[PDB]
Amino acid sequence: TKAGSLTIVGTGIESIGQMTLQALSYIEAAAKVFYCVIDPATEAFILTKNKNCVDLYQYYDNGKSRLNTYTQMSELMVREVRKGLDVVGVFYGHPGVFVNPSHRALAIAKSEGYRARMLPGVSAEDCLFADLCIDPSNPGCLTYEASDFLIRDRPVSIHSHLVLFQVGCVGIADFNFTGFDNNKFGVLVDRLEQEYGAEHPVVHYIAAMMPHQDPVTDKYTVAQLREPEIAKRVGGVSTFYIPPKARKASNLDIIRRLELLPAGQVPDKKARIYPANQWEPDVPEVEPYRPSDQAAIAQLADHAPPEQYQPLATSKAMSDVMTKLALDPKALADYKADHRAFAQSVPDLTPQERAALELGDSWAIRCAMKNMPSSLLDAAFPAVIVVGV
Amino acid sequence: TKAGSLTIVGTGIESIGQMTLQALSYIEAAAKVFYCVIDPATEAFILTKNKNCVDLYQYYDNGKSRLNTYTQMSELMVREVRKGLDVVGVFYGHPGVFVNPSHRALAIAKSEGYRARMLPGVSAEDCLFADLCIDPSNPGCLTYEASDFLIRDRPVSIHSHLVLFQVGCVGIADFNFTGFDNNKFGVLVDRLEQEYGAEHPVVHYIAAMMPHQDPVTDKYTVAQLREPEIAKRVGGVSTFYIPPKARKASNLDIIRRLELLPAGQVPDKKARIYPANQWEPDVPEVEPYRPSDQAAIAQLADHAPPEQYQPLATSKAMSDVMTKLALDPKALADYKADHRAFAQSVPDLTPQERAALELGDSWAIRCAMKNMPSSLLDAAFPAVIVVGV
Ligand SMILES: Nc1ncnc2c1ncn2[C@@H]1O[C@H](C[C@@H](N)CC[C@H](N)C(=O)O)[C@@H](O)[C@H]1O
Ligand SMILES: Nc1ncnc2c1ncn2[C@@H]1O[C@H](C[C@@H](N)CC[C@H](N)C(=O)O)[C@@H](O)[C@H]1O
């Protein structure tokens, strides 16, 4: 193992709070931190967590190709990796979602034989789902960069969600500190009119970046985007959400092959699961408390945990060590280097807990931390599926 | 304002570390916590952070419609909201990504006039981007639930990413504690063959759930998914990634309208930005250090921060309060109720810092925390765009 590693992490969108615990722990552990964030409170927070930080944002410039900036950003990180340092790169949101220099730097580090990993973060699209109250599952999600969407004539589905990033810099490859002169925005609007019609809704979405702010969730018709007062509101942190125009019908062959038949009464294409998408035009009211819902709720009074449910049955020592492995990158490295030596050094573990850590197998650890009922193991593996469409 | 609120949060995918700081803070602040997580270390962690937790997973049962479970899960949360409690629901990953009961509970709470919010988290798709080293931007991303994909004949694009969730329970609406008998998996494979061909790659993806694990990133051909030994590896935490088959050409009309013309030499449709997608079949090697890259790197020696770059210039007191607003939900509520009273109570703030908090405007706060150069304001607003495709 060569000295030197690159770990790229995110900060999420909303200041500080949307950073993951592991992003924070790696920032603290790093020999050197390179960051590219928008809000100053997140920047200030990062600087309190590591004494050796460099702002990558200073490598942008007016009329300077963003591609040249990205090469430089990547090279600054990889240079420090080559010197043998544990380097952390920090990008706002998810660091691999609409981000060039992270993928570049990691690929170079990997190709030169250094440890390289991206830790996922909360993207603007994650925020969009939360704030617009939609689920990519229902009814599928198409996500594009706005210029790419136009230039390569990327397909839309009128029956699925559409999310467009970078709608504030349509056709612009460079940078200006005072913002983009988004003069080709009308080209995007023409495409949206062709695909959806002039009266179809488009949600202008800006996630709150500070904890006390509300998101921008402004619905406009496609036609309204041509109004100069509306178009000028679209900036560098603007994303568009375009809801579906209609519900798609079910395929009879698939209904048959999946054996969803009974008497033929699969629900209608508009027989929606509550709640309906509130952005979709002319969506009918969906009843939250149907007779089936009421009957399910009536069963709560007599509910008991099923015999195959596996209650948590762990110990402070085991919870402590699993927490430490998640929150202390140095402890994790030590454990990964020698499971046995690490496991045997952890105080207060039971024999089963020690053995499970010695092995490292997910099953053994799960087994040490949950009571597995005899009924369960006699029948016949994580299984947590929380969507039913 | 009625007593009672519902805040739904995520834990991310990988045990503990992928929880956001705000998810943790809301879990700690809650009067009651309802959770649905897969790994026991995350469960144990949650139980150390709040004394009043209920496992929602006990409302699944063998042969019990998942829809009935979801109604019950939602109702357990909303009942406590109605009693006037600050309730936190916790779902693994992102709590609104392929999750029924979160959206249900929030919509009901909102309709009855209670405070209701979803906080985004790290989804399995976020993990997929990080672990497979792909960017949804390049070349667009289509995301579907696997049964829905089939039943409603959702379109694929051979030129964009395809991500399929719930590939381990194709056509299954119920639950079994011992896992799904995924007997209709072959129907998914037939669809993938029709769309992509028998020799096209499909990546079986399982993100590591424990900090020491590696992800499953196993490439198979579509044809190989028919092998029983391979099909049985696909379970409840399996996601498929299907890379593009080809590069899409540019639209000449759009090239003209966006004025990307010069002598006509837009890059070829295969003239890729490094790095190439390593999963895509027959991708050529892309040079990381082209002459343009080398020239950009040569400019680093003489680099100075641009005159319009805005250096951080804050104080401990201001950083402390912005951190507190992000990490202390009670402090945030107090600040939101009365900006002036809150701002005037914060020790050690400068006059400008106090005034900025009194107003709450993003501009004023940004202004108090960053030195804005005279050159910047004379020219003519966040602007952090890190992808150039
Ligand atoms: N606060 C925000 N609200 C909505 N969309 C945003 C926000 N910030 C960034 N974006 C979107 O992300 C684009 C910038 C991207 N290069 C970076 C995205 C970032 N890596 C993420 O994870 O979301 C913007 O042009 C917007 O489309
Ligand atoms: N560890 C994992 N690796 C890859 N995919 C996963 C993992 N865990 C869950 N999934 C995907 O998510 C599905 C379950 C969903 N109902 C819940 C997803 C969860 N809310 C998320 O944010 O990803 C599974 O069937 C998989 O498709």
Residue numbers in the entry:
A (entry chain A), B (entry chain A): 7 to 386, 398 to 406
Q: Could you give the paper's own sentences about this structure?
A:
While chemical methylation of an amide bond uses a strong base to generate the imidate, OphA, the precursor protein of the fungal peptide macrocycle omphalotin A, self-hypermethylates amides at pH 7 using S-adenosyl methionine (SAM) as cofactor. Omphalotin A derives from the C terminus of the OphA protein, and it is the OphA protein that methylates its own C terminus using S-adenosyl methionine (SAM). The structure of OphA reveals a complex catenane-like arrangement in which the peptide substrate is clamped with its amide nitrogen aligned for nucleophilic attack on the methyl group of SAM. Here, we report the structure of the peptide amide methyltransferase OphA including complexes with cofactor [SAM and S-adenosyl homocysteine (SAH)], cofactor analog, substrate, and product.
Mutants Y63F, Y66F, Y76F, R72A, R72K, Y98A, Y98F, Q172A, and W400A of OphAΔC6 were expressed in E. coli. Superposition of both sinefungin complexes with the OphAΔC6 Y63F-SAH, OphAΔC18-SAM, and OphAΔC18-SAH complexes shows similar consistency in the protein structure, cofactor, and where present substrate positions. We conclude that the extensive hydrogen-bonding network at the active site and the catenane-like arrangement lead to a highly rigid active site. In both sinefungin complexes, the two nitrogen atoms (sinefungin and amide) approach close enough to form a hydrogen bond (distance varies between 3.1 and 3.3 Å).
